[PDB]
């Protein structure tokens, strides 16, 4: 009933998930021997993260969460206490043939008509039925729409699983957008990958065109999509502070031709969001579209972060000494070693006008694994993806090891060592929070 706004984050607070906060606080308690680190973890626990509907069972509740209604009810209470609008971040993530480029069957719904019928009736419909309840008119929902989906159709269509998934990604995203856009307090942010996947002109361009086709297939057209979100569950840095000029040439050799960048001009997500905003508008979207970056794990801080330019005559040595992204390769999506927490969630961050940023958000919740690092038997029926395997030399990474973090649990499970590293390596640094009872000398 309230009017639908251009940017639901402006002047708003964001939902804080008490279940994830409790997981963070438990991790902090396990750092009793390192009280300064525990204090930083306590600060992290106060930050807003998205709630993932990563399977049908998450709607009513499962071993990983208490159900969607629990969060919506919590969000209305948090909005009342804030006295300003509140955005509840929700991830829509269950397409038939999900994650078609993974060499594994990662999605619970197969890429078949039966899978699509279940996506519509047992996944989207119950979510929309809850979101449309008049009980929730007092909150805003920012729905991140299907990470790791549509751009596979323009970059990874050589994989048969992506060919099979293609009609279901198009029809499933259309259905999600149609059902969710009909709810006036829902704001749809289409996932746009990240610069290490789509920054090349040959990938960015066709992706923007495909997003416009999807928009035009919906009943409301371009109005169905409020904005776009990059870097979800990835680690590509917000900015490369030392490599700020991707056109720099050293002795007639472009630094973008380095092994790490593979001729891509987009070294970071600020540049990528500016690039995609341009292309999306040119493809038919209104200039009012806004962008989000998932800053949950893209900080690349800690002692390994370069602090000044190391001089070199060789483009690879120059890039490798000066990049803050310390991954083996920008395609390393599964628990890459050394990642740190990035900027805290924030409405309308300043200083990046061309990126048209509605907010920085934590879509992936820091501490949750991207996937298991070995083929562990499990009561989720989840399957093993070698991109999470520290032993795997991946063709997707120019024949290099994944650099994945070992001893990783299933996706969504708490990853103890990874969270320690994420907090230690945060950029900006994290300040500590100390409860009042711990300010007195213990007696």
Author numbering: 1 to 443
Give verbatim excerpts from the published study on this entry.
Cellobiohydrolases (CBHs) play key roles in degradation of crystalline cellulose, which is the homopolymer of β-1,4-linked glucose and fundamental component of plant cell wall. High hydrolytic activity of CBHs against crystalline cellulose is achieved by the unique structure of the catalytic domain (CD), which consists of tunnel-shaped substrate-binding sites covered by loops. The unique function of CBH is a unidirectional movement on cellulose surface coupled with processive hydrolysis of the cellulose chain into cellobiose, the minimum repeating unit. In contrast, GH6 CBH from the bacterium C. fimi (CfCel6B) has CBM2-CBD and three fibronectin type 3 domains (FN3s) as a linker between CD and CBD.
We solved a crystal structure of CfCel6B CD with 1.3 Å resolution, to clarify the structural difference between CfCel6B and TrCel6A CDs. In the determined crystal structure of CfCel6B CD, we confirmed that the Val43, which is close to the N terminus of CfCel6B (without signal peptide) and mutated to Cys in the single-molecule fluorescence imaging, was located in the opposite side of the catalytic site. Overall structure of CfCel6B CD was similar to that of the TrCel6A CD except for the additional subsite and loops. In the crystal structure, CfCel6B has additional substrate-binding site (subsite) constructed by Trp303 at plus side, the same as TfCel6B. This additional subsite is stabilized by two loops (shown in blue) which are not found in TrCel6A. Near the product-binding site, a pair of exit loops has been also found in CfCel6B and TfCel6B. The exit loop 1 (shown in green) was capping the end of the substrate-binding tunnel. This exit loop 1 of CfCel6B is 4 amino acids shorter than that of TfCel6B, indicating that the tunnel of CfCel6B is more open than that of TfCel6B. In addition, the exit loop 2 (shown in cyan) of CfCel6B showed more open conformations compared with that of TfCel6B. The Ser105 and the N-terminal loop of CfCel6B, crystallized without ligand, stayed outside of the cleft. The slow component for CD, which was not found in TrCel6A, has been observed in CfCel6B. This result strongly suggests that CfCel6B CD has higher processivity than TrCel6A CD by the additional subsite and loops observed in the crystal structure.
